[PDB]
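S.,

Sequence below, as promised.
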Amino acid sequence: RMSHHYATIEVSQQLEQLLGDQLVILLRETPDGQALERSQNDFRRVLEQGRANTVDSAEQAALDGVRDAYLQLQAHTPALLEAPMADNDGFSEAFNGLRLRLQDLQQLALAGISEAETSARHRA
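The prediction came back faster than expected:
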C-alpha cells in the first residue's frame, strides 16, 4: 500500500543527486571523461533498476518519461569533452525537462502515500 511509494521517492532523490554530479562535471573547464561516464552509467543503473522494481503503474509511466528526458539530455554530451556545447538552448531545455520530471515523480509518489494513508484509516 505505501512502502513502494517511499522507494520511488528515494529513486528520484538519487537520480537528482547523480544529475547534479553530471552538471558539476560538465561545468568544469576540463571535465573528466571517466567520471562523466561513470555518473551517466550510475544514473541509468538507478533509473532502470528503479523502473524494473516500481509497482505503481503511474509511477512506471513517469519513470519511462524520465528515461526519455534523460536520453535527451545525454544526447547533448559532446563527443569531445573539451569541445563547446553545440546547442545551448537545447541542453538547457533538456536539463529543465528532466529535473522537472524528477521533482514531479516525488510529488506523484507523495500523493500515492497520502491516499494510502487515508485508506488505511478507514480499513479498520
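The chain has four helices and no strands.

Coffee later?
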